[PDB]
Each structure stands twice: as C-alpha cells, then as structure tokens.
Amino acid sequence: QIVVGICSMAKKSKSKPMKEILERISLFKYITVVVFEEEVILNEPVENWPLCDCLISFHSKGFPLDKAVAYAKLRNPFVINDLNMQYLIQDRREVYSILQAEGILLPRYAILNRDPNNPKECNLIEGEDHVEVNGEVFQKPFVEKPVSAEDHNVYIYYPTSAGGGSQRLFRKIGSRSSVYSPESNVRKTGSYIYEEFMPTDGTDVKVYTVGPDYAHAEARKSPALDGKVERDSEGKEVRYPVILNAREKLIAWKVCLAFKQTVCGFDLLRANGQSYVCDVNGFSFVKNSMKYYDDCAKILGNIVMRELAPQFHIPWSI
Numbered sequence: 405q406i407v408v409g410i411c412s413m414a415k416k417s418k419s420k421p422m423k424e425i426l427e428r429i430s431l432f433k434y435i436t437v438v439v440f441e442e443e444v445i446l447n448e449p450v451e452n453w454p455l456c457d458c459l460i461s462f463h464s465k466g467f468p469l470d471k472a473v474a475y476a477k478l479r480n481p482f483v484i485n486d487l488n489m490q491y492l493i494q495d496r497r498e499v500y501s502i503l504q505a506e507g508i509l510l511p512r513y514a515i516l517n518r519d520p521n522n523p524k525e526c527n528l529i530e531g532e533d534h535v536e537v538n539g540e541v542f543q544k545p546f547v548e549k550p551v552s553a554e555d556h557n558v559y560i561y562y563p564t565s566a567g568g569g570s571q572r573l574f575r576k577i578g579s580r581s582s583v584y585s586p587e588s589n590v591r592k593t594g595s596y597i598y599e600e601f602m603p604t605d606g607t608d609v610k611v612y613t614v615g616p617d618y619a620h621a622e623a624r625k626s627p628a629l630d631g632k633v634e635r636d637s638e639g640k641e642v643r644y645p646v647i648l649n650a651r652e653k654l655i656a657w658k659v660c661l662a663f664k665q666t667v668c669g670f671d672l673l674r675a676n677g678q679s680y681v682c683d684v685n686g687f688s689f690v691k692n693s694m695k696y697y698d699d700c701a702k703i704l705g706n707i708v709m710r711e712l713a714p715q716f717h718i719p720w721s722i
C-alpha cells in the first residue's frame with residue numbers, strides 16, 4: 405500500500421472539500437490516506453510524525469513550515485506541493501518576480517520597501533491624484549498591497565474626478581469584503597506594492613489547478629468598488645461561470661509549474677482584452693462542486709500511482 409500523507413492545519417485538513425477529496429482518493433485500490441493530527445504537527449518532533457510515501461503539505465496561518473521541510477528531508481517522500489516555494493508565496497514581491505520571469509502578464513507595479521533602520525530614506529512622494537514610487541508615477545486609481553501575501557488589507561485609491569477617498573479591502577467578514585473611506589492619502593508606515601488599477605467588468609476570475617493540465621475557473625463580484633457580498637436566494641455566495649480561453653489555459657500551466665504547487669489557485673483580471681495575474685495563493689480547493697471533487701481526486705491518485713507503482717511493483721498502465 406502506497407501511503408499518502410496529508411500535512412496541514414486542522415482547519416484545512418478537516419474542511420469539507422478536503423474530506424470529500426480524501427474520501428475519493430481512498431477509493432484507489434493501492435492507496436491509503438493518513439491525515440497528520442494538528443497536535444502531532446505542532447507538538448511532536450518530525451521523527452515521530454507518521455510515515456508516508458507521498459506528501460501533500462501546505463502552509464496556512466499557524467503552520468510550522470520549517471518542520472514540514474525537515475520532515476520531507478528526513479523521510480524523502482514524493483512531494484505534491486513543493487515546500488520551499490511556500491516561503492516565497494508568502495511574499496508578494498517574490499510572487500511578482502516569478503511571474504515576470506515566466507513572461508506572465510501582470511499590472512505595472514512598483515515595490516515600496518520601508519526600512520526601519522533608515523529613516524532618512526524616502527522613495528515615495530505623494531500628490532493629490534498620484535504617487536511617485538522609486539521615481540515612477542502611478543495616477544489614481546491605483547492599488548496598494550501589503551508586501552505580506554497573508555495581509556489582505558489591500559487599498560484602492562480613487563482619483564479626485566471620481567470623488568477621491570479609498571476602498572479598504574479585507575478578509576470577508578460575513579456580508580462585506582470592503583468599505584469606502586474618505587481618506588485619500590496612502591498609508592504612512594509599512595512596505596507596499598503599488599500597481600495600476602485594471603478595469604474589469606466588475607468581476608474577478610479565480611482559477612484552480614490540479615497539475616498544469618487541469619484548471620477550473622469561476623468568477624465572483626469584485627470587492628474593488630462595492631464591498632457588499634452577493635448571496636443566493638438560498639444563502640451561498642454567488643459565483644459566475646467561466647471558461648478559460650487558450651491564452652488563459654497556458655497561463656494556468658505556467659503558474660502551476662513556476663510555483664511548483666500541483667493543487668493551487670490564482671486570480672485573473674480580464675481587462676483591455678488581456679488577462680493579468682497578480683495574486684497566487686498556492687494550495688486551494690474548489691468548494692461545492694462534485695465534479696471538481698471527482699476530477700481532483702482522480703488526477704491526484706493517478707499522479708501518485710504513475711510516480712510510485714513501479715517501486716511498489718504495482719500493475720499500472722499509462
């Protein structure tokens with residue numbers, strides 16, 4: 405029996421989509437699924453962690469990535485999502501650098517690094533309708549993102565001509581994903597990425613891959629200009645259908661390989677006849693889609709079998 409180890413925080417490992425997917429992987433004749441207990445992950449040394457032949461491990465808040473890396477180095481399992489890349493995914497500056505290296509379209513942007521050791525350094529000049537970052541001008545509207553990919557406090561600054569002020573985005577609190585603020589001045593402390601605001605039709609596209617050749621997309625209302633979350637007549641968040649075009653299917657292929665995360669998600673902005681990526685989230689499942697659960701589990705089980713059946717002298721064709 406090939407053992408597939410699942411290593412993440414309990415919030416993730418016990419989520420409905422995870423359980424749905426692991427149920428289906430368990431249907432593979434030669435695969436056994438072992439889910440690492442969060443108490444073991446946090447409290448036990450990696451030498452006591454359960455063995456596996458294939459590891460699916462991913463960082464989220466509170467997760468000890470150093471320990472996951474140490475475990476994989478100790479046991480040498482087949483790794484589905486590369487662990488070292490998961491440090492980089494936490495830093496938006498590292499993300500944009502990789503996308504640029506891969507020739508992936510993204511908004512024009514500039515990084516503002518604020519060193520607390522150097523108070524006499526200034527690389528941002530603010531005007532009424534623009535900012536100058538490292539000498540480069542961004543006219544309003546522009547977007548201001550914390551360099552930490554885990555900090556969802558993204559602000560959008562409106563031009564005088566539209567009423568000024570700003571939209572402050574945040575991790576969804578129930579009925580809301582953003583709020584308007586009369587504040588027109590940018591944040592005075594911290595490091596930020598500034599980028600051009602891309603006009604879309606009011607929706608954001610979310611793409612979810614299972615390896616480079618499978619990508620499911622769906623859209624939702626953008627929190628950019630209105631912060632009210634749309635809900636079903638039943639009560640679920642409203643999603644819109646998306647089919648990726650050939651250029652976008654290629655983007656998905658590139659993002660998956662560049663960041664070395666088999667199961668991963670990223671965002672697309674459809675603007676000016678093109679598609680821009682400027683958020684890469686790593687390990688992500690689609691929720692509430694039985695077809696996705698079916699396909700995801702099949703792809704993952706097939707990947708495991710293809711890689712490992714030879715070692716275990718298990719019959720497996722193509």
Ligand SMILES: Nc1ncnc2c1ncn2[C@@H]1O[C@H](COP(=O)(O)OP(=O)(O)OP(=O)(O)O)[C@@H](O)[C@H]1O
Binds near residue numbers: 557599627
């Ligand atoms: N350059 C841009 N132009 C237009 N809209 C943007 C731009 N950058 C981000 N947005 C809007 O801001 C929202 C939040 O930005 P982004 O997704 O980068 O932040 P995040 O905090 O990483 O969100 P999450 O990880 O939950 O998907 C996007 O979904 C999109 O609606």
